[PDB]
Structure 1
Amino acid sequence: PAPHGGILQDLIARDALKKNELLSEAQSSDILVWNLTPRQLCDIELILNGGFSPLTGFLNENDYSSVVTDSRLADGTLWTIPITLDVDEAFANQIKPDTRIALFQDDEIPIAILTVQDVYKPNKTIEAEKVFRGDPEHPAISYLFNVAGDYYVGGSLEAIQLPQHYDYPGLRKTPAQLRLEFQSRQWDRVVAFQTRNPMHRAHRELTVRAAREANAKVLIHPVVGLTKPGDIDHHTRVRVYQEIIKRYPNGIAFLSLLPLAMRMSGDREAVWHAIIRKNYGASHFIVGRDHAGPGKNSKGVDFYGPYDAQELVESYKHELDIEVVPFRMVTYLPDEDRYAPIDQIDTTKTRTLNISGTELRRRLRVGGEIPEWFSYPEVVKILRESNPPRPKQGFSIVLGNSLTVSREQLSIALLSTFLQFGGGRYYKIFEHNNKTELLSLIQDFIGSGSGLIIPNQWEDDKDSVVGKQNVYLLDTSSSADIQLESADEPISHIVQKVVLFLEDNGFFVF
């Protein structure tokens, strides 16, 4: 179908003969410069290549406001997610309309020149409530208040080049490129599948049903920009994707990576995804259970209904101009050894089985087996590879402040003890001396699979610098992970407590 708004806004193509000129300007000693943030680099690349058509810059207050209260651009164009350039008060204060800002990447690569139309200070609470449903634990809300700048700069863009990427070089097809791909193959019907997690049996089956129902070819269009904190990294996923694509019949599917920065905005996000996929050349778009939803909040309540997205997309049906292929919870049927939409089976006279993400995360962490029927073995292998079981995980033991025994001697004792176990883990007594340049390495080591013995705590002001994962506190404090009986407890006693704790948590296996 035609790109949203009718015109593919490929600004790279549009501004081709301005490149050298824009480049010079971007590099002049007088232009205002802003180094794009990660999500901003994700958004600007979708703007510059026509993925966010009709958009051609970041939303101004008028357009932004309409999107928030209307799910539409000022002119009425259906648009649910606000795309804005958030900056800080400092930078904002140097901006005036008509001003031209050079937007860089990594403070080195000139991406584009923004021509300021306005500088406003959004009410983050309204955006939070109206666009993301207001739950503070919601990924987009947390980002909004904790990472996003407090001042938005609206304005038109002029392309210099798309953000640089050294991985998966040929796979990040642009709307124009993908459209050309489908064309060279004479694909006039393509159903797109959005995804931010690895694909298992259910997915393969559901995407194939879609291809069969829609009579269209399959586009696995995974998100590699930004997703939900805690998601499997995109590299591990691209591998999972390239592997699973070999399970489809020869010539039915195409893989293309989408550098989109998700918002986990359930239903609004689905409407947005459909618009994006249409721009990219898809004729059909899959919207399954809890599309783009972030699950439940700590209280166990749903951020979005399991089918809110489907319903919203359905209400915008005649406007989207792209066909939606809805799916009900696709589950496993033991007795018939096959998958199928829950709405097609009698959950009364037929038994179903389902390994949830939580459940999977768990197996991977304990080294537990994952059913042959759940996912393909190569997929699981790749997952295990980058999400190793506890006996392969790294960790850190911190000698609490309450500790009264010799920290040096307790450290050595723990070191020598861990060493005798053997098995491949690297151990080290890591003194940070409160230097953040060191504190910031604690997780690099844990991430490398190493066991670190830390002689003492770090200032509370520096706590943010350290990634809490697999970091355990040894102390008499009630809030210690490994609680000591008393600050003067004999070393050997402490060592056994720590060993058994780590063994109880899968780090050690004898």
Structure 2
Amino acid sequence: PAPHGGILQDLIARDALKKNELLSEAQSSDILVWNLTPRQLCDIELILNGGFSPLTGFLNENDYSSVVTDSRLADGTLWTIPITLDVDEAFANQIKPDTRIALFQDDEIPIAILTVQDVYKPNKTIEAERVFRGDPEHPAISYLFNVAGDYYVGGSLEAIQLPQHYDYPGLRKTPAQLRLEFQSRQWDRVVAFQTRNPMHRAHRELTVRAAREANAKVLIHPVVGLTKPGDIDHHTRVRVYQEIIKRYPNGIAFLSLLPLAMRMSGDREAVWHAIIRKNYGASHFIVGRDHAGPGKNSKGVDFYGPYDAQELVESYKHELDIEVVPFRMVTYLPDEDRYAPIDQIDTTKTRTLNISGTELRRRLRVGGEIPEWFSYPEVVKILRESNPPRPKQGFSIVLGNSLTVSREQLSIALLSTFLQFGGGRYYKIFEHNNKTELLSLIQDFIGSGSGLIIPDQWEDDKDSVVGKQNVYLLDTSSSADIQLESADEPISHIVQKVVLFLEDNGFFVF
């Protein structure tokens, strides 16, 4: 179908004859420079390559308010997710309309020249409730208030180059490239599959089922820009993707990476994804259960209903200009060893089986077996390798403030005790002395599978520098992960307590 709004706004093509000139302006001594954030990098690439057509820059207050309240750009164009350049007061104060700012990547690579239209201070609570449904634990809201600048800068963009990427040079196709790919294959019907998670048997079946339903070739279009915090990394996922694409009949599927930054915005996001897939050359788009939804909040309640996205998308059906292929929960059928949409079964008579993501993380954490029917063996292998079970995981034991015993001796005892277990883990007594340079390496070691014995705590102001993953507190306090009986509990007694705790939590298996 035609790109949204009718014209693929591929600004790299458009501005090809201005590259040299633009390149020089960005590197000039007098121009104002803004280093793009990782989310702004994902967005600008989608803007510059035509993926966000009809967009040609970051939204000004007028288009943004319309998107916020109407799910449309000022001119009525259907657009549900606001794409804005968020900066701080300090930088904002340095600009006015007509100003030309140069946008860089890593303070080295010039990306584009932005021509300012306006500078405004959005009300984040309206944006938070209107676009994302207001729940503070929502990834998009949490980001909006804790990471995004308080000032947005609207303006038109002029391309210099798409953001740099060194992984998968050939796989990140632009809308124009993907289109030639389909074309060279004479693919006039293509159903796209959005995904930010690894694909399992269920996913493979619903995509093939969609291919057969729509008489279309299959496009696996995974997101490799930002997704939901805690997701399985994109490198591990590409490997899972490149592995599962081989379980499709030869010549039916095509894999392409999408550097999009999701907002995990359920129904609104699905609408957005469809627009994006149409721009990329798909004629059909899949929207399954809880599409782009972030699950449930700490209180156990749904951010979106399991089929809100399908409903919202269904309502814009006639103006989307891309065919939506909906699916109800596809589940496994033990008694028939096959997969099928829950809306075509049940009513009792047939038993169904499902393994939730929570159940999988857990199987991966304990080293438990994962059913041959659930996923493909080689996919499970790739997942176990990058998300190793507890006995292969790193961890840190932090000697609390309350300790009265010898910190030097308690550390040595823990180090020697741990070293006698063996099993390939590397241990170290780690002194951070409250230095950020050091504090920030803690999670690197844990990520490497190492066990760190930490002699004393870091001051509270520094706490934010350290991830708390697999970091455990030894102390007399009630908030200690490993609770001491007394501040001066003898060393041997403490070592046993720590050893058995680490074993109870699977770090040690004898």
TM range, normalised to the smaller chain?
A: over 0.9
- Give the CA deviation at 1:470: 0.1
- Equivalents in 1 of 2:154, 2:325: separation in Å? 35
Output the CA distance in 1 between the equivalents of 2:335 and 2:479: 48
- State the shift of 1:65 in Å: 0.3
Establish whether residue 396 from structure 1 lines up as the match of residue 396 from structure 2: yes
Looking at structure 2, the residues matched to 317 and 334 of structure 1 have their Cα atoms a distance apart, in angstroms, of 35
Q: Deviations over 1:404-428 (max 9, x none)?
A: 0000000000000000000000000
Which secondary structure does the structure 2 equivalent of 1:497 belong to? helix
Equivalents in 2 of 1:424, 1:509: separation in Å? 12
| Aligned mates of 2:192, 2:422 — CA distance in 1 | 48
How far does the alpha carbon of each residue in 1:171-230 deviate from its partner, in whole angstroms, 9 at most, with x for none?
000000000000000000000000000000000000000000000000000000000000
Report the Cα distance in structure 2 between the residues aligned to 1:173 and 1:194, rounded to whole angstroms: 15
**1:408 match: secondary structure:** helix
CA distance in 2, matches of 1:353, 1:412: 49
CA displacement, residues 206-264 of structure 1 (integer Å, 9 cap, x when unaligned): 00000000000000000000000000000000000000000000000000000000000
Residues 247-303 of structure 1 show CA distances to partners (whole Å, capped at 9, x for unaligned) of 000000000000000000000000000000000000000000000000000000000
Separation in 1 of the partners of 2:49 and 2:349? 51
Query: Deviation of residue 90 (structure 1)?
Result: 0.3
Give 1:43's aligned residue.
Answer: 43
Per-residue CA deviations over 1:436-462 (Å, capped at 9, x if unaligned) read 100000000000000000000000000
| Alpha-carbon separation, structure 2, partners of 1:491 and 1:373 | 49
The count of residues paired between Structure 1 and Structure 2 equals 510
Q: What is the SS of the residue equivalent to 1:47?
A: helix
Give distance in 2, aligned partners of 1:254 and 1:163. Answer: 23
Aligned-partner SS, 2:369: coil
1:33 & 1:457 partners in 2: Cα distance?
Answer: 39
Listed one character per residue, the Cα deviations across residues 366-425 of structure 1 (whole Å, up to 9, x for unaligned) are 000000000000000000010000000000000000000000000000000000000000
Counterpart-to-counterpart distance in 1, 2:456 and 2:101? 47
Instruction: Provide the secondary structure at the position in 1 that maps to 2:62.
Output: helix
User: CA separation in 2, counterparts of 1:135 and 1:64?
Assistant: 21
SS at 1:304 equivalent? coil
SS at match of 2:336: coil
1:347 deviates by 3.8
C-alpha distance in 2 between matches for 1:200 and 1:411: 44
Task: Give how far 1:346 is off.
Answer: 2.3
Distance 2:303 2:346 in 1: 28
Which digits, 9 at most, give the CA deviation of each residue in 1:58-82, with x for residues without a partner?
0000000000000000000000000
Post-superposition Cα deviations, 1:69-124, rounded to whole Å, max 9, x if no partner, equal 00000000000000000000000000110000000000000000000000000000
1:63 corresponds to which residue?
63
Structure 1 length-normalised TM? 1.00
* Structure 2 Cα separation of the partners of residues 402 and 354 of structure 1: 46
1: CA distance, partners of 2:347 / 2:274: 31
TM-score (normalised: structure 2): 1.00
Which digits, 9 at most, give the CA deviation of each residue in 1:291-319, with x for residues without a partner? 00000000000000000000000000000
Q: Please state whether the residue corresponding to 1:162 is helix, strand or coil.
A: coil
Q: Structure 1: how far apart are the matches of 2:300 and 2:16?
A: 51
Shift of 1:341: 0.1
- 2:29 matched to which residue of 1? 29
Identity %: 100
Q: Write the distance in 2 (CA, Å) between the matches of 1:346 and 1:96.
A: 62
Could you say what secondary structure the match of 1:13 adopts?
A: helix
Cα distance in 2, alignment partners of residues 487 and 386 from structure 1 = 39
The whole-number CA distance in structure 2 between the counterparts of 1:346 and 1:16 is 57
Quote the Cα distance in structure 1 between the aligned partners of 2:346 and 2:43: 44
* 1:4 to partner: Cα distance: 0.1
Q: In the alignment, which residue of structure 1 is the partner of 2:362?
A: 362
RMSD of the TM alignment (CA)? 0.3
Looking at structure 2, the residues matched to 423 and 361 of structure 1 have their Cα atoms a distance apart, in angstroms, of 23
Partners of 1:471 and 1:404 lie apart in 2 by: 21
Consecutive unaligned residues in structure 1, runs of 5 or more = none
Secondary structure of 1:335's aligned partner = helix
Aligned residue for 2:14?
14
Q: SS in structure 2 opposite 1:39?
A: helix
2:110 matched to which residue of 1? Answer: 110
Counterpart position of 2:53: 53
Distance in structure 1 (CA, Å) of the matches to 2:38 and 2:289 = 28
User: Against the structure 1 CA distance between its residues 419 and 499, is the aligned structure 2 distance closer, same or farther, given a 3 Å change threshold?
Assistant: same
SS at match of 2:409: helix
Q: Deviations over 1:40-60 (max 9, x none)?
A: 000000000000000000000
User: C-alpha distance in 2, partners of 1:158/1:234?
Assistant: 29
